[model samples]
Target: SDFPQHSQHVLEQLNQQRQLGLLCDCTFVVDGVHFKAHKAVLAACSEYFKMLFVDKDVVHLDISNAAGLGQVLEFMYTAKLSLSPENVDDVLAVATFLQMQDIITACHALKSLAQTLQMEIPNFGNSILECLNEQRLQGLYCDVSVVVKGHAFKAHRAVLAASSSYFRDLFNNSRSAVVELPAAVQPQSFQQILSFCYTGRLSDQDLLMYTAGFLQIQEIMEKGTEFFLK
Candidate 1:
């Protein structure tokens, strides 16, 4: 007689496709390689995140390798991945799409460093905003104005007056144009602009304002700029 405790250990491999009710999914061959849209979407997402967060000098990324495929799969399931050079573009796209500000900032810093070392011109501002229309710019301008109010409008008018003509113009224009800013911002914006001119270290808020008014700022930074802030 067989003992009751001698039960067989049953084993079975779980099919995710069947469990997820995707049995009818089709795969196509393209140029001797199999292509799947679902996989492509996941790959794109992984690439975006990698591009945004990975430092090129830190790690080598071989996307065609088993390890790379595993990393991409993990990201699809967990929304996290190891940063690597080969997948950096994908990571960057992910970060941008997800509105991950910190990652974006890091990407910008790395890009700036690369530009300095390679003596290359980085055109992120133009490239990033190439698709932006007038309506988008208006919204961006409002956001920049808020940033200026928060970070830049706390300096002394006299100090600001001694700074660049561009700062003075921005201050004067803002004063005349903005009617709703609190008394604090009225003076702070002027002071912030002055600080940028004197120190060339523009705050993030000031940068936003400068970006929004790039053409005007460029003209002011050029020549024939009229201001007697001093």
Candidate 2:
């Protein structure tokens, strides 16, 4: 009946009409505040109010925060929602109750919204290592088992490969569940090395340093060499 942009133009006029409190047939009470809005706009977007206006002309919302209801009502009229970290929860609270499907789905995407606005911290590498070590301690996602003498230790192949030149060559083309370490490799020293693989820090500097050198871990050997000079 009208141009394609006429629909958007009509909504703009309706929004301005409500802003000036003109032709508003309904009064919504929230947190003791009265918001005058058109019944047509609320009923168009919110099924909650559509059924509500049918039974009674009166409207009183039992929302926790008036700001939530205020933003919800504004969105119904303007089709624009002002959102931020502080107000997302409050806005979602009222949007959920209002049964605004579009707004509800918009609130659900805040997970990606946070990641979209994400910024990296300088300690992210350290945090990653800490979390990886935690996972290793939990015995989660371990793919390799190293057997030293009769004792067995579970570990991740990628972590071992990344940390040790010896393991890198050992796992270069090999795909095995268990690696039988030689008799010279003690369980105690290997345990310390395993800890060092997950965590860059070593509890036993001298023991870990020697084991790392034998295992061909360059960083640990360099740090250990520095310890003597320092």
Candidate 3:
């Protein structure tokens, strides 16, 4: 990773503020001790925000407090920011609107963490729902599942409508450690396969899907290899 010059600059400015005792009450301390300190601080922050948020620069820019100037000042000095689950979606929306890559990455990490803990986070939930909807519509869900498994698993109406014999043949020709199915398959197993393909993470539901038939599961595994290579 490259060294972040912007972050370094911001840190230096912060240190200067500290040295001059210009940071007070979580606000830019303005006195004769510092000339136009408030405006200078605000201008610096605005410039940084424009660079990081507006320009989508991943280096440094803090828009932690969206409330008011006072809160903004708090963030400027302390670098202390807090985001709750309820407001996380809004925060991420703001980040996305501004095209802030660092903030977006942070939001994604937070979302993944929430998912790991089985937390009902709105931002993550919305993203997952969007992906699911897209997969269902784009036939990626079916394509991925059918590729991973010998036959299409619980493919939606779109999948059935767009089924390609060529893809099936491709699967059959591919090298795989698993075996192929000799007959028709069921929907439940297909759902499990779909889950795996979309998430790159599997669940107990996946294991359960193939519990009734190893041959079908094996076929799916073989098919999955073909898809990966393709």
Best by lDDT: 2
Off by over 4 Å in 1: 1-123, 129-133, 136-177, 180-230
Looking at model 3, report the run of 10 residues with the lowest lDDT sum: 156-165
Local accuracy of candidate 2 as per-residue lDDT tens digits, 34-152: 77765545554556866786575344556777788888877765556756677777888888887777666667776445232222234433444555466567665566799988888
Residue 14 Cα positional deviation in candidate 2, in Å, after optimal superposition: 1.2
**lDDT per model, in order?**
0.33, 0.63, 0.37
The pairs that clash in candidate 3 are: 148-220, 148-224, 149-220, 153-190
Q: Between prediction 2 and prediction 3, which has the larger TM-score?
A: 2
User: What's the TM-score of every candidate structure?
Assistant: 0.18, 0.45, 0.23
Per-residue alpha-carbon lDDT of candidate 1 for residues 54-154, written as tens digits (9 for 90 to 100)? 33313332333333344333343333444544545555554555555544554555555313211111432222122122213333212123223444223
**Which structure is stronger by TM-score: 1 or 2?**
2
Count of backbone collisions in candidate 3: 4
lDDT-wise, the better of 1 and 3 is 3
Candidates sorted by TM-score, descending order? Answer: 2, 3, 1
Clash tally for model 2 = 0
